[PDB]
Amino acid sequence: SGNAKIGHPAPNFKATAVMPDGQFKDISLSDYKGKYVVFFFYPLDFTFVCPTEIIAFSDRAEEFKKLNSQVIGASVDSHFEHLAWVNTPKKQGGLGPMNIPLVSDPKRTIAQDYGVLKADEGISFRGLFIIDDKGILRQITVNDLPVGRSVDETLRLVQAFQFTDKHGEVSPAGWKPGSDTIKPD
């Protein structure tokens, strides 16, 4: 998958994005060093699909927050398009106020970097990558266009990498087997 390899640092990106507050910011994956990152791609902005996923991720942002993880959404649209889609209310199809930032991939190099570009129509597949606090990549999930992603599954994954992480801060056990310690016969 692109230049995204498991065990290796995430392919960095800088792009311009819309933030939970509305204003553009100009951010990079590196700003997030020190937190887990859930980085996901969607096809494009004004899908006649009611945007089940992004909304669901924006909606349980707190749960990610307490796992010290940041959720970021990407699509090859301009950030103008993202801004536009955010201000469109959820009743007449739109995203509404996001609790999560939205990256814009107009040159489409991030999609390639992450090996998720549909060459022909030039959009991203439904990709999602988990990167840890040290900027390493832990898991790759890519879906063909018609099938959404599960928030619970993403949480289960983050919680499991963090479970394994946290268990590596361990102190010498101060204990050894010995004849004292044998379980006889």
């Binding site: 096809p43 899908t47 006649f48 009611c50 199809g93 063909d144 266009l145 018609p146």
Partner: protein, 99 residues
């Protein structure tokens, strides 16, 4: 864009979509009270390789259920002409060789 009274049975809804039943019930509610505060859905109008008339529906996820949970024959919708590449965005390798 003219709003059309399209039959629920005409609409192809090929997307696996898990619905919040609370959202749906709130919509059924509002409908019987104030049907004109509920905006029309968007329906992709696609012509296949021949005469072929197909009308997809991808939005109004919770709005569709609301209308089919009621008895309703038709739902208010805006019609949108579209290519097959338009369609390919939604269905990927599950896009049909429409005729």
């Amino acid at each position: 864009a003219a709003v059309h009274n399209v039959p629920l049975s005409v609409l192809i809804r090929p997307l696996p979509s898990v619905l919040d039943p609370a959202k749906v019930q709130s919509l059924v509610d509002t409908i019987r009270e104030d049907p004109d505060s509920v905006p029309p859905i968007d329906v992709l109008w696609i012509k296949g390789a021949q005469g072929g008339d197909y009308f997809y529906s991808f939005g109004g996820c919770h709005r569709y259920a609301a209308y089919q949970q009621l008895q309703r024959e038709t739902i208010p919708a805006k019609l949108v002409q579209s290519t097959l590449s338009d369609l390919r965005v939604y269905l990927g390798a599950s896009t049909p060789d429409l005729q």
